[PDB]
């Protein structure tokens, strides 16, 4: 499942990701952009035994449990596979824990490398939210 720029923003907004820990609705859609490019089944593997999953590209080492990663914490306490659904709740719900975690959104490399400050509102342009 591959969300729409705004089709997303809307589901992201509903989940209340706006002004989240000072993160505007734009900070998110920008990350989900550069990360999975809005794909809910996106997976990428690393050179540490870990795999990032779904739209926000949560990572098995700390966040979810995929049964094969070393030094697994499962902070979001969920099977990573749930992170692959079309229902961005797993994902959105899990990102919320990542933030609490005092680096903020710096955790999203593609965020923190493609939309630091910048004009994240870009992504909401015309997004009637």
């Amino acid at each position: 499942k591959v969300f729409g720029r705004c089709e997303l923003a809307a589901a992201m907004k509903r989940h209340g990701l706006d002004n989240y820990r000072g993160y505007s609705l734009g900070n998110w859609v920008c990350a989900a952009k550069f990360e999975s490019n809005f794909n809910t089944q996106a997976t990428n593997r690393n050179t540490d035994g870990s795999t990032d999953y779904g739209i926000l590209q949560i990572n098995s080492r700390w966040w979810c449990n995929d049964g094969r990663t070393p030094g697994s914490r499962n902070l979001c306490n969920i099977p990573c596979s749930a992170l692959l659904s079309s229902d961005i709740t797993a994902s959105v719900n899990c990102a919320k824990k990542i933030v609490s975690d005092g680096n903020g959104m710096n955790a999203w490399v593609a965020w923190r490398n493609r939309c630091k400050g910048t004009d994240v509102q870009a992504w909401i342009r015309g997004c009637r939210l």
Partner: antibody
Amino acid sequence: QVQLQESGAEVMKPGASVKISCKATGYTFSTYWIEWVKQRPGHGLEWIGEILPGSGSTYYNEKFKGKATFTADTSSNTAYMQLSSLTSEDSAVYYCARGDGNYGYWGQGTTLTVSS
Amino acid sequence: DIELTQSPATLSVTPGDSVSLSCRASQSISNNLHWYQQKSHESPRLLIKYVSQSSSGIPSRFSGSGSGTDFTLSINSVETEDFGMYFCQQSNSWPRTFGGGTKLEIKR
């Protein structure tokens, strides 16, 4: 007990295809990845790829991408692998294994022979 | 891919002797290597995981250690039942890679 049961020997013409199945019992089947491995007599093992059954997600070793094709029936608890356009070089034993980092649980193997 | 190269290809050992198998990774796979044993016909069988953790049921005779690019499985006192093929696999990256196997035959 966690078990993986695979299909029996296959003897095929060159150019046809085959579909090796991997029925897996004893665990939340949507949770772990199924990885496939190939063992040709004279080579070591060779990783073909993996499927996370039910998610739509698969990854191929660049070599096999285009010739292996993983699907899965969450209903039945079977993951399948299709290999098409069979050449002599396809004749081997294939295995499904549940993706644990290590592979602690393997299937019994399936022997494929390709010949005219 | 990360190429693991095994040595020796073959090894003839008298039962009761000790042996070391070598697995060297083309690049640091950190602590992400497992060893399997395979008797003729059957699926491989995990002996060691993440370089050195015992999988229950495996005879204490089998132990592993190492790190970086060099791993070793040691079989202290080989029985007649330890003879088959022996592979190391990495789970660091994808594709997963297996070494070429060390074939352990009985000396007589």
